Amino acid sequence: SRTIGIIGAPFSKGQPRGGVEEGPTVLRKAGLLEKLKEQECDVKDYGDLPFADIPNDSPFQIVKNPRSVGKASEQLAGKVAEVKKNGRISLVLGGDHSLAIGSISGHARVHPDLGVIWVDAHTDINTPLTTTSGNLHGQPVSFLLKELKGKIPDVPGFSWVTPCISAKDIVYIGLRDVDPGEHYILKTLGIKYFSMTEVDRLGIGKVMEETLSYLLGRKKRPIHLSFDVDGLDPSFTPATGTPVVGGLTYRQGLYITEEIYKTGLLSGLDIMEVNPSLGKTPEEVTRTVNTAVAITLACFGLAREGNHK
Amino acid sequence: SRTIGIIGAPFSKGQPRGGVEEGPTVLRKAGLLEKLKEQECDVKDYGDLPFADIPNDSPFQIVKNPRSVGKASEQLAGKVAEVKKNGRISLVLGGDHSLAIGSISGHARVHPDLGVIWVDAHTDINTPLTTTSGNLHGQPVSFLLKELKGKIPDVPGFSWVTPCISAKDIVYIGLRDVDPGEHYILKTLGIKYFSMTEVDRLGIGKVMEETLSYLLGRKKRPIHLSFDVDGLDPSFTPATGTPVVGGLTYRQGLYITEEIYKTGLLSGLDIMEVNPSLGKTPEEVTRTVNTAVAITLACFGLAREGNHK
Amino acid sequence: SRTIGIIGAPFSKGQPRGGVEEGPTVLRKAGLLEKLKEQECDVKDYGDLPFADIPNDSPFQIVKNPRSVGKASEQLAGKVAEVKKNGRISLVLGGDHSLAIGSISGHARVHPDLGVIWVDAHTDINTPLTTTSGNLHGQPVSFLLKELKGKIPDVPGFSWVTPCISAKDIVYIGLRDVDPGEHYILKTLGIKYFSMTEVDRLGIGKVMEETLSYLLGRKKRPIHLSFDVDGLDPSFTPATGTPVVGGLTYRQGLYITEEIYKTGLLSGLDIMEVNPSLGKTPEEVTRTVNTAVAITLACFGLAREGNHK
Numbered sequence: 001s002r003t004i005g006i007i008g009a010p011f012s013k014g015q016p017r018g019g020v021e022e023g024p025t026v027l028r029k030a031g032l033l034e035k036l037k038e039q040e041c042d043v044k045d046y047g048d049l050p051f052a053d054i055p056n057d058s059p060f061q062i063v064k065n066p067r068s069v070g071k072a073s074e075q076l077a078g079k080v081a082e083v084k085k086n087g088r089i090s091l092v093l094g095g096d097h098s099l100a101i102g103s104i105s106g107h108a109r110v111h112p113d114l115g116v117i118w119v120d121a122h123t124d125i126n127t128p129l130t131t132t133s134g135n136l137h138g139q140p141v142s143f144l145l146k147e148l149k150g151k152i153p154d155v156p157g158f159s160w161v162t163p164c165i166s167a168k169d170i171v172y173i174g175l176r177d178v179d180p181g182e183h184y185i186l187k188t189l190g191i192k193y194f195s196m197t198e199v200d201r202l203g204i205g206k207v208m209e210e211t212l213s214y215l216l217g218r219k220k221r222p223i224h225l226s227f228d229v230d231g232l233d234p235s236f237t238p239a240t241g242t243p244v245v246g247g248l249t250y251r252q253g254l255y256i257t258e259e260i261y262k263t264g265l266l267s268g269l270d271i272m273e274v275n276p277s278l279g280k281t282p283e284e285v286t287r288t289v290n291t292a293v294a295i296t297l298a299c300f301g302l303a304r305e306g307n308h309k
Numbered sequence: 310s311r312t313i314g315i316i317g318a319p320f321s322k323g324q325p326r327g328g329v330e331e332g333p334t335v336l337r338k339a340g341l342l343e344k345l346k347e348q349e350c351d352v353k354d355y356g357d358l359p360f361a362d363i364p365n366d367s368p369f370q371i372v373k374n375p376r377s378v379g380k381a382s383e384q385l386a387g388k389v390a391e392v393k394k395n396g397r398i399s400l401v402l403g404g405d406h407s408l409a410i411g412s413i414s415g416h417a418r419v420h421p422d423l424g425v426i427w428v429d430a431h432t433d434i435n436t437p438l439t440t441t442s443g444n445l446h447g448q449p450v451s452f453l454l455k456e457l458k459g460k461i462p463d464v465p466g467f468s469w470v471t472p473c474i475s476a477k478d479i480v481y482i483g484l485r486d487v488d489p490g491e492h493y494i495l496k497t498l499g500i501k502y503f504s505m506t507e508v509d510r511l512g513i514g515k516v517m518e519e520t521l522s523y524l525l526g527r528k529k530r531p532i533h534l535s536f537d538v539d540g541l542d543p544s545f546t547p548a549t550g551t552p553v554v555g556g557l558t559y560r561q562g563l564y565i566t567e568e569i570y571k572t573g574l575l576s577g578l579d580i581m582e583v584n585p586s587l588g589k590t591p592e593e594v595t596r597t598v599n600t601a602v603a604i605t606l607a608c609f610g611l612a613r614e615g616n617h618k
Numbered sequence: 619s620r621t622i623g624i625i626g627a628p629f630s631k632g633q634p635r636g637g638v639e640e641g642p643t644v645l646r647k648a649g650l651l652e653k654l655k656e657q658e659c660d661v662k663d664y665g666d667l668p669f670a671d672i673p674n675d676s677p678f679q680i681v682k683n684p685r686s687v688g689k690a691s692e693q694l695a696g697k698v699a700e701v702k703k704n705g706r707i708s709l710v711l712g713g714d715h716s717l718a719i720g721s722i723s724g725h726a727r728v729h730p731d732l733g734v735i736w737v738d739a740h741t742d743i744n745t746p747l748t749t750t751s752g753n754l755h756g757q758p759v760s761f762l763l764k765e766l767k768g769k770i771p772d773v774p775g776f777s778w779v780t781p782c783i784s785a786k787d788i789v790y791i792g793l794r795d796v797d798p799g800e801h802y803i804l805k806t807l808g809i810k811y812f813s814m815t816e817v818d819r820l821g822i823g824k825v826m827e828e829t830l831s832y833l834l835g836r837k838k839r840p841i842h843l844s845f846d847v848d849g850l851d852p853s854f855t856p857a858t859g860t861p862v863v864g865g866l867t868y869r870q871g872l873y874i875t876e877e878i879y880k881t882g883l884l885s886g887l888d889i890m891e892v893n894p895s896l897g898k899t900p901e902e903v904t905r906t907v908n909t910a911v912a913i914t915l916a917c918f919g920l921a922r923e924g925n926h927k
């Protein structure tokens with residue numbers, strides 16, 4: 001069938017609010033393993049990677065925690081190749097979406113041919129020289145992008161990085177807050193993206209068919225879904241660090257995942273940007289966490305129409 | 310025009326929470342008659358059927374209140390034929406969705422040629438031998454289904470039942486919680502169904518056109534819409550006994566009904582599973598009840614674009 | 619590029635609740651000017667028109683404040699021609715949707731060839747002789763409509779009015795509460811309209827393409843978008859005087875505006891029916907006001923996918 005390879009990643013130095021490290025914990029305690037098990041799958045729990053804080057991690061210009069971040073992605077990069085090595089799907093319940101540099105790295109080391117689906121309200125493609133806020137959780141893509149190589153400077157922590165995916169091989173879904181420089185990158189590189197504008201025009205039914213035919217048209221290669229919880233409307237996932245209104249509906253989040261699942265080409269998965277601490281009432285934490293589990297499971301089989309052996 | 314035949318059915322022994330018997334009451338007191346009247350229709354209020362509790366109604370295996378349930382459907386079965394007999398549309402504001410065995414019975418006795426539209430978050434097609442919870446409110450379809458005859462055992466209360474509708478003559482809309490055995494029945498019998506997955510893919514616009522062309526393609530026969538309030542998202546109908554998230558929007562519920570109305574082939578209608586007692590605030594009761602009325606009326610003419618004589 | 623011409627219009631005598639006059643104020647204080655500026659546009663703030671209350675404004679039959687209303691539209695009519703005169707888009711943050719008679723007047727005086735997009739949960743096409751409630755905020759269209767001339771009586775305050783737009787030149791979007799007489803006008807005149815029923819059938823993607831091809835098919839003429847905040851669901855714009863459930867989603871409101879913007883044929887705009895006083899919590903005021911700004915800006919360039927110079 002499809003074997004799962006779990007990697008907990010309680011990292012938060014890719015952005016300001018630390019709580020995001022609570023993700024693996026909360027995710028796990030919400031009953032993620034048993035639920036996957038209730039389905040058809042050999043869950044391999046490679047545990048939570050221990051990250052040793054970098055004592056002297058002085059900024060690169062305005063970029064905070066570069067080494068702290070770059071190593072977490074390096075550590076994670078190795079691991080992710082080990083699970084893809086044991087012929088299993090890599091499942092990364094992350095902290096901040098900066099780890100994406102890591103996930104996609106180890107995955108590519110194995111399947112350099114993969115295709116990416118970036119579900120997120122943000123592009124996360126700012127470079128170390130375009131970032132305004134200066135947080136790394138919003139620049140992962142620019143490190144992975146081949147056509148962007150040369151645009152990216154030499155930052156402490158990422159000597160190891162080698163651009164793996166090309167502009168013609170990633171698709172964005174759920175975008176509604178792109179920085180002026182990120183938009184310039186989007187249109188100039190010719191990146192395929194479905195902002196909330198297109199989801200409204202085509203509906204999620206057409207959006208999914210187009211993303212997948214655009215990705216799996218020529219060849220049937222490995223798929224990597226980087227999933228940022230803030231891709232969905234804050235009424236479904238309120239406990240995120242950077243939420244925007246006009247997001248994807250509970251149902252829309254479930255359609256994407258069921259459709260990706262259905263192709264059976266998923267090789268890598270990451271569930272990012274959830275921070276229970278940032279939720280208002282205790283139920284908003286429940287609402288953001290449960291919704292998160294409700295999506296992971298759909299990726300691994302669960303369909304609203306039913307299942308059976 | 311189209312004459313209405315009202316039948317109140319305060320039954321609840323098809324499931325655990327009794328409040329569902331409040332439906333006819335609350336429905337009526339919400340001003341259902343006058344509103345229908347405000348439109349074009351001869352409302353015939355055949356009243357609320359008096360159900361005498363069955364003193365000794367011991368379970369059939371794990372199936373509770375079999376006789377209590379089977380007779381309510383038998384009583385109701387008769388009545389429903391009387392209204393279809395007086396050339397009127399049968400309108401059943403029910404209690405629990407177990408009465409469906411009854412509604413569809415008396416209706417079929419008259420128009421054995423009818424077609425069914427099961428709007429519900431659940432299939433309600435468990436047999437007396439597949440039911441896990443063991444409640445009858447989640448097995449009505451298996452009693453009505455011809456291809457299922459032979460699968461259904463001999464249970465106290467339903468000697469009278471004769472499978473009326475066939476697998477190729479019912480359509481499910483709003484499904485998102487189907488039991489492992491129910492799903493096996495769905496796919497094996499080749500039943501037409503639009504789970505929330507398809508509503509997301511095709512949108513309600515295409516879903517309605519496809520359900521109706523699939524049903525009314527060959528011939529223009531009678532239509533029976535069994536409507537379970539939990540078919541809609543619990544933010545619109547929170548006062549239900551078994552609600553699921555990811556449901557149908559207020560607007561989507563209204564589109565189905567306006568489209569069914571527009572065909573003018575509606576012969577039977579049932580509004581089930583509403584239980585005011587199960588609502589949190591007093592307004593959630595108002596929200597679930599009013600939404601319910603807002604759908605009934607659409608079935609009988611009211612259109613968001615307007616009306617006039 | 620596209621120059622903006624602002625006209626504040628704190629008018630409320632077109633309906634009962636006065637607060638609607640707070641619109642220009644709240645709108646402005648919410649940072650509307652700077653935000654437009656953040657984009658590409660020469661904002662011309664022609665200020666808030668001073669309206670002198672009419673001491674003796676006795677009703678015309680059941681029509682309250684006729685002169686008070688008719689002059690506000692006359693005053694506004696002049697002004698709107700001045701901004702269209704300075705080759706700028708007319709932006710009218712109004713009070714009650716009765717001012718529409720005015721906006722569309724001065725605009726037409728300049729571009730008698732314009733096309734109209736009436737986004738609203740209501741048709742607002744009752745005549746002085748069909749109006750039941752008797753409020754003018756729900757009859758603006760009947761004064762502007764050519765085919766309706768002759769149906770409209772001679773009411774104090776509007777001798778100046780000359781029907782500018784024809785039945786084949788306006789489109790309604792977001793309708794869900796049309797009076798029996800308004801519906802009769804709709805169907806008889808052959809007016810193009812997309813009630814919530816059609817938005818559900820075609821989705822907003824098809825709705826926008828059809829409205830614009832129906833309007834801009836033959837010729838590429840000026841566009842006037844009259845925007846009533848109650849066109850959207852009261853969960854997005856709760857602080858309105860006459861809100862209805864089943865409305866347009868935040869996202870749907872944004873799609874319309876981005877699509878209208880994209881044609882680059884917008885010449886006139888009005889943002890009506892917002893009344894902060896009528897909101898429950900202080901945040902519902904924030905929710906209704908911010909949502910309003912989020913739409914204005916989309917009309918003038920802001921796109922969820924991004925922007926840049």
Ligand SMILES: N[C@@H](CSCC[B-](O)(O)O)C(=O)O
Pocket residue numbers: 096097098120121122123124126131132133134135137138177178179228230242273
């Ligand atoms: N435009 C923002 C992007 S924040 C992105 C956050 B997240 O990882 O959740 O997408 C910046 O420059 O930090």
Ligand SMILES: N[C@@H](CSCC[B-](O)(O)O)C(=O)O
Pocket residue numbers: 405406407429430431432433435440441442443444446447486487488537539551582
């Ligand atoms: N799978 C559940 C179905 S409960 C159905 C409830 B109702 O009538 O509301 O659809 C069971 O076996 O009882």
Ligand SMILES: N[C@@H](CSCC[B-](O)(O)O)C(=O)O
Pocket residue numbers: 714715716738739740741742744749750751752753755756795796797846848860891
């Ligand atoms: N049918 C109502 C329409 S109220 C319309 C209000 B508004 O301007 O917001 O659309 C009447 O006759 O007053």
Ligand SMILES: [Mn+2]
Pocket residue numbers: 097120122124137228273
């Ligand atoms: Mn992200």
Ligand SMILES: [Mn+2]
Pocket residue numbers: 120121122228230231242273
């Ligand atoms: Mn994000």
Ligand SMILES: [Mn+2]
Pocket residue numbers: 406429431433446537582
């Ligand atoms: Mn049911």
Ligand SMILES: [Mn+2]
Pocket residue numbers: 429430431537539540551582
């Ligand atoms: Mn149900």
Ligand SMILES: [Mn+2]
Pocket residue numbers: 715738740742755846891
């Ligand atoms: Mn209006």
Ligand SMILES: [Mn+2]
Pocket residue numbers: 738739740846848849860891
């Ligand atoms: Mn309105």
